[PDB]
Structure formats: structure tokens, C-alpha cells
Design a protein around this nucleic acid. Structure first.
Lengths: 100, 98, 150, 127, 206
RNA sequence: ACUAUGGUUUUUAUU
RNA sequence: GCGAAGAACCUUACCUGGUCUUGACAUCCACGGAAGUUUUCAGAGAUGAGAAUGUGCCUUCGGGAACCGUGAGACAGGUGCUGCAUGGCUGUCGUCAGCUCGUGUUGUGAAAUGUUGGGUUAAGUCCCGCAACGAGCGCAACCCUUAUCCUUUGUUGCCAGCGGUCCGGCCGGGAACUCAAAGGAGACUGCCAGUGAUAAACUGGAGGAAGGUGGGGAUGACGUCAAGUCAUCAUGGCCCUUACGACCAGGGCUACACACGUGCUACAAUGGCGCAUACAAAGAGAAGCGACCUCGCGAGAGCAAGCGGACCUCAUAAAGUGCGUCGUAGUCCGGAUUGGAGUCUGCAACUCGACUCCAUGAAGUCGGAAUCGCUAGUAAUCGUGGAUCAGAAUGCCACGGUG
């Protein structure tokens, strides 16, 4: 694998912060003509339709020691192919061994 | 009026923390209900056994998350004022509710 | 090899009675529903007692007297010589082998109802009228000559 | 004289208690008529004990939880036979002719790595 | 078949984890990410200071990192108070205020990691390491070992040729889980290869 | 009682 | 369904067209700017041009750090070549009883002996007797799990006895039972009878909840194929440089003559249909799991409580039971390519994705030679959750009933 991901992360985390992560509940009022008489949504709709690159699609987070598409342990943040020297040596709290 | 929670990943460490709670909150006022053990949320944590070309075997680890409520009945905020200051060693989480 | 665990001794039943009747309600069990054979055990006999035998008390005795294997056949070799060889069967389970040959045919034949698929099989078994038994006998008859060895 | 015993089998857990009195049976605090089974009543508690007589001059109390309902009957039979096997020196060995005083130890055997469900050995089949 | 880690089988037996703290699973991944970062931030800040092991304690609004060394003097540093660079390096990355905590290693010439480091410092120079292996074995049986083993294997040139070298005394029971046996690997990272060394030390059962 | 055939060259340390 | 937990885009190796040259990305040595925000046109986009806007940190105010950008050479970079090349990682003989060495012995030496030979076993296991006598790795044991007895504390888990009580642990109370976790105890071939150089060691019995490495796991002795893997992670040398590098957009992977691997649903009638009716168990979960209740044939979409989880919610146990009904038929059962309208994520499902409702409808009558897998809660059989994840799996990982 290549070390190509940070050159995308640096533009795509901000793309998400500006055009995704704080734009989800907006969908429940942006198109409603009964919920507003003030003109407030037309202009931010024209802004929200500007980006065309990634956010929910074309972009996966990938592991940190290698940008592999899979093997990321969701509630731990580590790759299952770069964890054995820590896991075996008792470096993750609460995991026990051996035989059960 | 108020109640507490204690969490850990080990049976002997949560006892070693219970020994501090009874000494920190349950002597003045003197509180007599003993500690129930509660479920440990037993589960296997699993990953592929080898980093290359094997997907057939998995490495087995034992996970437990222990809970103690210890029980308090004195309504005063003074019941927890020292427990929110004293040890309580590293490896456990305490919580004050209501 | 030689070990192998010791083969089982089965059981009787406090309602179905004998070890063979307790086998009848447990053999050829498929889908595990375990309530189907207790309406088919000793329930095909009242018509058998007026088709291929007499009484509900002897209708199944005679079926396992007409279906009676006395010899098995198997290949045997000794170096560069091979024979089909006949061997006498052991008596203690002999009637349970005969039972199996009836209850399986009610499954392997699919004609009308299950209230017929066994009763229609038993009425030929109580007469030794099984499928293709002339060519079955033609093997044991051919193997008889090999009890004289080489 | 009064008798007591406990018993388990495949997620079923039972207890049985026995008193002198008139032949009455209670199961899960209600009279035996308020119970349902797909086979005939009072058999699994009587037939293993006709060597000393049962349920005619004795007052019964039974509790059962968990598992299949004919597995519950097995657990009750283990409980009531273990409750009374002390009644005579030979009764401990007369109950082994049926085998009900031996415990049915069935309770999910632990998984082997890398094998699917309990101990079942690997299969590679063709070639 | 198998052999996935020489210590992964034994290191739960009467041994607390190398990091101690609690976090709810919905808070845990960033709490663990920071736990690897405090090791990495230490290993970029502290070098040659005779450190064998470090242990992580993260109690409420606090972090403590036990540093085990043969030379407390070269970790505590200049005038016994050159600790602030070594204390504060973990504080901003862990998100909690940091304390300093040092420990002295019991029999450093009978500890497999520090014996390996003495050999690695001579493998990274390709001279005197074979003498250091021989002497580590001679001395361990007089320090308190019931057996000792070392190994260097593969290439070390120069020439393409492959060579193994050990020196060995007594016993090294790996599979006896009451053996209480010490094991460590070390690597030299040279312009002539990775150049690893393996060290085993046995002091006695229980 | 299944068995005839099968082209070339082949690896570790030494003063 | 191997390298690879999801093939619209993305992944992905490949192809094409654009474009960049000390390079997307690094150090070295120099020279400027904070990091960077806002906005319009052009371009498939990468970008190419403009127009607004910001001045954070440390400063002795000299300049600088992180960071951005641009250079002159050394160079950077490579899903390029190779594990007959190296570090690492695996596949396999192997839970088999094996592997190896010292001292004496034999031999002109390679080598032998020990490890043989008699008893015994799962066993290089123990004992005996030999020119052999000893020692270590593997074995066997230490670790871990389980049927059983004892013990500890009682909410969100339980209730025998005792007082009250539509007669619900609910309220006084309480661990006989259950649940929760832990710590102790029980089993040892010990006891007996036989068998056996009364040796070393088997067979059978009693008592027991449990009987003979206790039952079951963890394991993996040197070597072998001089095996695979550089594309899981590192890396040498050769090779590529206005590029074989890497920034993007459009295309490839269900492109077709058929074969080969592995699975799914049927061919039923102990089944199909109609109708009535019962019990879960384990898991996950706050722009969540979403009750009760609506709206839509229905996928779904709304309104709106409980609860941050032994609590509330997802949520409904199916098989079965029992009465009618059809009746081995290429159709009655079975469901593929259809005909029509709907449900949904997302930039977007025409082409490569899933779901639903109402008609239609092909194959399918247990399978070629041949060859593959086993043993009690196992095979078969029927219910549930969860991981991966913008969206989708009969796959993967767990729970339970009928057996």
C-alpha cells in the first residue's frame, strides 16, 4: 500500500465539517415552505449544492500505520494486522488471556 | 436522594476499589447494605490468528466489565464529597447520580 | 482400528414396550419433529391382519419372519486373489435389520399418502415380496460357491 | 418423615419437597390440575418410586424453570429420585438400574479454534 | 503449527496490564490512541538511559508513567531535577496533567532486555558483540540463572554468507507456564541489515 | 491382480 | 466468496485521455510568506487566472519554530523484477514418539552404541538386563474449562418457611431455591478381586453426580517441500525519470463458444392451502433502540412515552398444536428469465444494488462415471441477534427450541 491518504484527509475532513456533519437535520426544514416565511434556506441550498467530491461516498477513513481499506477495530481504532505485539503483551486494558 | 456506580475490567481490582468506597462513604453515616456482585458482561474479543493468508482461525481473548453499585441511603451531598476527592486507584471509573 | 468405542445396548420404552418398538419410533428420524411415528407405530396392522396376516398381535411378528436375512455378502482378498464371500449374520439384532428395510421404503417411495406408503409396503413384506429380490438372491447364490475358497 | 432434593438438565432447574399426608400434588404453587403436559399426569414422580409407594399417602411440592417442558419433567424426575434415594441402603443402586440418579450433564460444550460450533472436527473434503 | 507469540501465553498469569485505566466503549478508541502516543512520545524524547520497561497509570485527571532503569541517575538527569521535559512530554498529548515516577531495575545483568541492548550496541558496530554474548552467559550463572541462551542468525557482512551464534548454559523451559522465564528481542537497524538478537534467561520455577 | 513411462543442471564453512 | 469484511462512484491490479518534474511525498542547503479563510470565471477534473480577506506562537525585536510555497544539485517516488534473495508471516508431514549430545565401548573411516532386547502404553511411558552409563527438547505435568457439595451479598435478579394481601416479592421480612460472580471442597487407579518375570503393568467391580492421559482445550522437538508471500508490514540489487513516478476524469471486473471449484431453493403429499393458538434465549442501542397509535395492499413513512441500560425499546418465538380441505400431478407442488405500480441510500442505482404488492410463467419426477464427510446433543430441523457498511449479501460471527 501507498501513503497517499493524508493528502485527501486534510481536504476531506473540512469538506465534511462544512458540507456534511452539520447539514443532516437541515434537510428536515430547508425544503419546507410552511415552516418558514423568512427567506433563509434558498441561499444555503445554493451553497450546499456547491461540493461534488466525497463526504458519505468515495471516501473511507482507513488505518493509520497502513491505509488498508479493512481491518479497523471500530471501538478500539487499531488495525487487526498491526496490534499483536501490544495485545499479547497486555497493553490494552481489560483484555485477558489464556484459555477460556 | 443520591446514588453511586463503580466500573472496572477486573474482579480483584473492583474489590480493591470497593474497599475504598466503604471506607470513604459508608461509615459516617453508617450504611449497612452489603455489595451485590452483578453481571460481568462476558464476551469473546476476536481477531484473525495470523496477519497473512490465513482467515480460518481466530485468536481468543476474554473480556469482562464489572459493576458495583455498593448502595448508599444517606441523602446529603456530604456522602460523596470525599469520594470525589480520594483514591480510588487507576483502572476504575466512579459515577455520582441523582 | 480395534478401538473404536464399545457399541451401544439401546433401550425399551415405558409405553411403546420392547427394544425394537422403541427403535421403530426413533429410526429414520428426519427434520427432528419427533411426533410423526407415534401415529404410525402398530397402526398399519389392523388392515395387515386382513391382507397379509392375522391379528394385530401377530401382524408384525410375521413381517419380521418373512423378511429374515440369514447371510451377508462382502468382497474379501488375499494378495492377488479377490472373492465375493458369504457370512452368516448374528441373531441378536437380526430382526432390527429387517425392520429398517421396511420403514425406509415408505420414505424412498412417494405414492399417495403416508397413511398408505407404509401399509402398502408391509403387506408385501409379510409375504417376502420385496423389490428386485430375485437379483438380490442371485448374488448370494453366486457367492455360495466361494465358501469352497480358491 | 420429610424429604428434599434439587436437579438440573439442559437449561431446566427443579426442586422437590415431600411431606406425610393425603395424596396431593402442588407444582409451581398451584394444584396439579392447573398444569399442562402433552403426556399423562403424575407418572415421572411415581413410576421410579413404586418400590416404596408414591403420591397416595404423601403431600408433594414441586418447582421448575427453564428449558423444554419434557426436559423439565426429566429434571423433576432427577430431583425427586435424588430427594428419596436415602430412604434405603439399596435404593441408591435400584435407581441406577434406570439411571435417573446420574446427572444429565448437557450444557453447551465450549468452542474449538477455528472450528464452527463446539468440538466438530474440520472438513476439507475433495482432493 | 502455531507459535504466535512467546510471551502472549504467559503474560496474564499474576501480571496486571501494561496500561491501567477505565473508559466506556464509546470513549475508548481515542483513549487507547492516546495510550500508544504516550509510548511514542517517550521513545522520541528519552534515549540511551538504560530503560528496560515503562508502565501507564491514568487515574482521574492524572497520568503516571513508571520508568524502569538500571541507571536512575541518567533518567532523573542533571542535578536530580532535569525531569520536566520527561514529565510534560505526555501531558498535552494525554489531555491530563502529568507526574514523574522512576523505578530501579533488579539485577540489570540478569535482565534479558538490557543484556540484549548490551549486545545490540555492539551489533550496530559489528565488533566485540561475540565477546559480550560469551561474557553475558558466563556471568548470568554467577548472578542467579539456572540457565541462559542467546541467538544471532542469518547475514552479517560484507559477504553474503549466513551464520548463527549463541553461547548457552543450563535450561530454558519455554512451555512450562510456572517457569517464570524472561524473554526479549532487540534490533540494530544498520546499513547492513535489521540485525536482530534473541535472549532467554531462566532463574527458576515460581 | 490397477501401473508402463518420467529430457537438462541441482544446497550450507573457511584462512 | 485465496491475496481482499461488501464492485454504481469508491474498491482495483488493468486500459485511455488529460497533467506535473527536485516532483503527491522526504531530508540536506537556501529565500519569502503565519497555519490559512471568503468568492467568480474557465477546465471532465487535476488545475489555470483574478478579486476580496487573515496575521495565531516564541521574541531583546536580531529574527525564528510548527506549517505553506519556490528553488540549484545529491535525490525523492515505484500494486516495477525477485522470496532459487533477505527480515517478517504462513501452508504441510506432527499430539506422531520422535530429536540430539557427552563419557566409556566398536571400526583404518563414513559411522555405530545410547534410541537396542524382554514386559507395558496414548507414549523414547516405567521397569529389567546387556558395552554401555548418563543429560536436555518433544511426551507427561504446571495453565484453562466442566457435571457435583460448600460459602459470600441481595437491585434493575430470586421467595421455601412466617405475618398481612385479588391472593403480583406487592408490603413486613428471608437465602431453602434461582440469578449474578468468585473462593473453597470432590476423584486418586485410590480401594477391592483377578491377570502379569506377584517386577514394571492391564482388565473388571464397589461406592460415586462423575472412572481409568478423569472428560475437553491450550499446545506443536530438530529437520522436510531446499513450498507460498515483496500486492498485509519492512527491504537489497537491478530497472523506470518531464517517467513504468503521482494529481485527476472517463472506462474495464455479471465482457463469451463453454468447462472446473463451492453453495442456495425445490421435485412436496408424514406435504400444500384455510382457520385458531403457545413459550423464548442471547445480543445491540441518544440527530440512538423507538412503545402505544396512525397512514399507505406493502417495502416504508409519520406522531410520540420508556432508558443510557439485570431497568425500557428493538420484539413478534417458529417448528408444533388442532379442525376442515386438496390428492404424486412437469402440475396441485416449485419457483427462473417476466408484465405493471410502488419502498430506499446517495452526486447518482439506464448499465453493474436490495425490498414490496397483484396477475403470468420455464426448468425441476433426488440426480453421470466417480468420489467426499461421520458418531449425542453430533447429523438434520426451526426461531433471534450482531459485525462489515453512504446503499446491498442465502456469505461471516454468536444465542435458543425440536432432536
Amino acid at each position: 500500500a501507498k501513503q497517499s491518504m493524508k493528502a485527501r484527509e486534510v481536504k476531506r475532513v473540512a469538506l465534511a465539517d462544512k458540507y456534511f456533519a452539520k447539514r443532516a437535520e437541515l434537510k428536515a426544514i430547508i425544503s419546507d415552505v410552511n415552516a418558514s416565511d423568512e427567506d433563509r434556506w434558498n441561499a444555503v441550498l445554493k451553497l450546499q449544492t456547491l461540493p461534488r467530491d466525497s463526504s458519505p461516498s468515495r471516501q473511507r477513513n482507513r488505518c493509520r500505520q497502513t491505509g488498508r481499506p479493512h481491518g479497523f477495530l471500530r471501538k478500539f481504532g487499531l488495525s487487526r494486522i498491526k496490534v499483536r505485539e501490544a495485545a499479547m503483551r497486555g497493553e490494552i486494558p481489560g483484555l485477558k488471556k489464556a484459555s477460556w | 436522594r443520591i446514588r453511586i456506580r463503580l466500573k472496572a475490567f477486573d474482579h480483584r481490582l473492583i474489590d480493591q476499589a470497593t474497599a475504598e468506597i466503604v471506607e470513604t462513604a459508608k461509615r459516617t453515616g453508617a450504611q449497612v447494605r452489603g455489595p451485590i456482585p452483578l453481571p460481568t458482561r462476558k464476551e469473546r474479543f476476536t481477531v484473525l490468528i495470523s496477519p497473512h493468508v490465513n482467515k480460518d482461525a481466530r485468536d481468543q481473548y476474554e473480556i469482562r466489565t464489572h459493576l458495583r453499585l455498593v448502595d448508599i441511603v444517606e441523602p446529603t451531598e456530604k456522602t460523596v464529597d470525599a469520594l470525589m476527592r480520594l483514591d480510588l486507584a487507576a483502572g476504575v471509573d466512579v459515577q455520582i447520580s441523582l | 482400528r480395534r478401538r473404536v468405542i464399545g457399541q451401544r445396548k439401546i433401550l425399551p420404552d415405558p409405553k411403546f414396550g420392547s427394544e425394537l418398538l422403541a427403535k421403530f419410533v426413533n429410526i429414520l428420524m428426519v427434520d427432528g419433529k419427533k411426533s410423526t411415528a407415534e401415529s404410525i407405530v402398530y397402526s398399519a396392522l389392523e388392515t395387515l391382519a386382513q391382507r397379509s396376516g392375522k391379528s394385530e398381535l401377530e401382524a408384525f411378528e410375521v413381517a419380521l419372519e418373512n423378511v429374515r436375512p440369514t447371510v451377508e455378502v462382502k468382497s474379501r482378498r488375499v494378495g492377488g486373489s479377490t472373492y465375493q464371500v458369504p457370512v452368516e449374520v448374528r441373531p441378536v439384532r437380526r430382526n432390527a435389520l429387517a425392520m429398517r428395510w421396511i420403514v425406509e421404503a415408505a420414505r424412498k417411495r412417494g405414492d399417495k399418502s403416508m397413511a398408505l406408503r407404509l401399509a402398502n409396503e408391509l403387506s408385501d413384506a409379510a409375504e417376502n415380496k420385496g423389490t428386485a429380490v430375485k437379483k438380490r438372491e442371485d448374488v448370494h447364490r453366486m457367492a455360495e460357491a466361494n465358501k469352497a475358497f480358491a | 418423615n420429610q424429604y428434599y432434593g434439587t436437579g438440573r438438565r439442559k437449561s431446566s432447574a427443579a426442586r422437590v419437597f415431600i411431606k406425610p399426608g393425603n395424596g396431593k400434588i402442588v407444582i409451581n404453587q398451584r394444584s396439579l390440575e392447573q398444569y399442562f403436559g402433552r403426556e399423562t399426569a403424575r407418572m415421572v414422580v411415581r413410576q421410579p418410586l413404586e418400590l416404596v409407594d408414591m403420591v397416595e399417602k404423601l403431600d408433594l411440592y414441586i418447582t421448575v424453570k427453564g428449558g423444554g417442558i419434557s426436559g423439565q419433567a426429566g429434571a423433576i424426575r432427577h430431583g425427586i429420585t435424588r430427594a428419596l434415594m436415602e430412604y434405603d441402603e439399596s435404593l441408591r443402586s435400584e435407581l441406577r438400574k434406570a439411571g435417573f440418579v446420574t446427572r444429565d450433564a448437557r450444557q453447551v460444550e465450549r468452542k474449538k479454534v477455528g472450528l464452527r460450533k463446539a468440538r466438530r472436527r474440520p472438513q476439507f473434503s475433495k482432493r | 503449527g502455531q507459535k504466535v507469540h512467546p510471551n502472549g501465553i504467559r503474560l496474564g498469569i499474576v501480571k496486571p496490564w501494561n496500561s491501567t485505566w477505565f473508559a466506556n466503549t464509546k470513549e475508548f478508541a481515542d483513549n487507547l490512541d492516546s495510550d500508544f502516543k504516550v509510548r511514542q512520545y517517550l521513545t522520541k524524547e528519552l534515549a540511551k538511559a538504560s530503560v528496560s520497561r515503562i508502565v501507564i497509570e491514568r487515574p482521574a485527571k492524572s497520568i503516571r508513567v513508571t520508568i524502569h532503569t538500571a541507571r536512575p541517575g541518567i533518567v532523573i538527569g542533571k542535578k536530580g531535577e532535569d525531569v520536566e521535559k520527561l514529565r510534560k512530554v505526555v501531558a498535552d498529548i494525554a489531555g491530563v496533567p502529568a507526574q514523574i515516577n522512576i523505578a530501579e531495575v533488579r539485577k540489570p545483568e540478569l535482565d534479558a532486555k538490557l543484556v540484549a541492548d548490551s549486545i545490540t550496541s555492539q551489533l550496530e558496530r559489528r565488533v566485540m558483540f561475540r565477546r559480550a554474548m560469551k561474557r553475558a552467559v558466563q556471568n548470568a550463572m554467577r548472578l542467579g540463572a539456572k540457565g541462559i541462551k542467546v541467538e544471532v542468525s542469518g547475514r552479517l557482512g560484507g559477504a553474503e554468507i549466513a551464520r548463527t551464534e549463541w553461547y548457552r548454559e543450563g535450561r530454558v523451559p519455554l512451555h512450562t507456564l510456572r517457569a517464570d522465564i524472561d524473554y526479549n528481542t532487540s534490533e540494530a537497524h544498520t546499513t547492513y541489515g535489521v540485525i536482530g538478537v534473541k535472549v532467554w534467561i531462566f532463574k527458576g520455577e515460581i
